Design a protein around this ligand. Structure first.
Ligand SMILES: *[C@@H]1O[C@H](CO)[C@@H](O[C@@H]2O[C@H](CO)[C@@H](O[C@@H]3O[C@H](CO)[C@@H](O)[C@H](O)[C@@H]3O)[C@H](O)[C@H]2NC(C)=O)[C@H](O)[C@H]1NC(C)=O
Ligand SMILES: *[C@@H]1O[C@H](CO)[C@@H](O[C@@H]2O[C@H](CO)[C@@H](O)[C@H](O)[C@H]2NC(C)=O)[C@H](O)[C@H]1NC(C)=O
Ligand SMILES: *[C@@H]1O[C@H](CO)[C@@H](O[C@H]2O[C@H](CO)[C@@H](O)[C@H](O)[C@H]2NC(C)=O)[C@H](O)[C@H]1NC(C)=O
Lengths: 107, 86
């Protein structure tokens, strides 16, 4: 579970386009076991690659026809480990849209 | 070899002569990235980050009875799928 450079995608709903920032985040492998004996008394969250520390940033997002280009603040991974995704800040899913998902036009 | 690929291993605590009892354990890919907008919207319960968990789990098991008089799962195939806890 290193900490590698990926390519997130920031978008302006109003302008039908997206910009590509090259920020750094988490990814890699972690160890887990599927208990052969499952005690009814849950649980054991199981570890996973994620963030330990995340500093924020901001960037310039071009505007267009009828909107002034603005500022966008995005999280950046400081250090990665195999902890337990912090539900109080993270949407822990099996499969998400992906860091570079661009929904040019909402809905 | 830093993180051995998820596979079956004999579970010593429940294995017995001639009749073992395999278990899935090992590593699986995972990652975290900034939540895209389209989801941060459908997210009435707004979350700034997203993680794609994927722990090692049995693809199939028999579930046998053993020594202690209780029943354990006897895994026969494994794969990195979703984290459902136990
Ligand atoms: C838990 O599940 C494992 C599944 O592997 C069981 O072990 C397997 O048991 C079979 C049947 O004895 C072993 O034999 C295999 O099929 C025939 C049987 O004569 C043989 O010709 C094949 O060459 C092959 O060996 C098989 O080797 C064995 N597999 C492993 C990985 O050990 C185990 O018995 C189950 N335990 C319980 C308590 O149900
Ligand atoms: C992603 O993180 C950084 C680049 O952002 C890479 O690590 C070093 O980072 C410094 C700047 O902080 C670069 O000047 C160095 O060139 C990088 N190290 C090396 C050996 O080149 C890191 O390598 C990147 N991740 C990947 C997978 O390339
Ligand atoms: C995720 O948590 C909050 C969600 O409430 C995010 O909100 C922050 O950024 C907003 C965008 O400008 C600000 O308006 C909010 O004031 C600010 N929230 C707080 C508590 O400062 C935030 O970006 C993410 N991280 C944190 C630590 O809040």
């Amino acid at each position: 579970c290193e900490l590698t450079n990926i390519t997130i995608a920031i978008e302006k709903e109003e302008c039908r386009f997206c910009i590509s920032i090259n920020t750094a985040w988490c990814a890699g492998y972690c160890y887990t076991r599927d208990l052969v004996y499952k005690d009814p008394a849950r649980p054991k969250i199981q570890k996973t690659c994620t963030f330990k520390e995340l500093v924020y940033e901001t960037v310039r997002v071009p505007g267009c026809a009828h909107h002034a280009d603005s500022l966008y603040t995005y999280p950046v991974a400081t250090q990665c480990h195999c902890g337990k995704c912090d539900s109080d800040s993270t949407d822990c899913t099996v499969r998400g849209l992906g860091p570079s998902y661009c929904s040019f036009g909402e809905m | 070899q830093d993180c051995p690929e998820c596979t079956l291993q004999e579970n010593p605590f429940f294995s017995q002569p001639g009749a073992p009892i395999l278990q899935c354990m090992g590593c699986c890919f995972s990652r975290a990235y900034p939540t895209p907008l389209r989801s941060k919207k459908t997210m009435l319960v707004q979350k700034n980050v997203t993680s794609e968990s994927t722990c090692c789990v049995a693809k199939s098991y028999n579930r046998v009875t053993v020594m202690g008089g209780f029943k354990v799962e006897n895994h026969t195939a494994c794969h990195c799928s979703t984290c459902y806890y136990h």
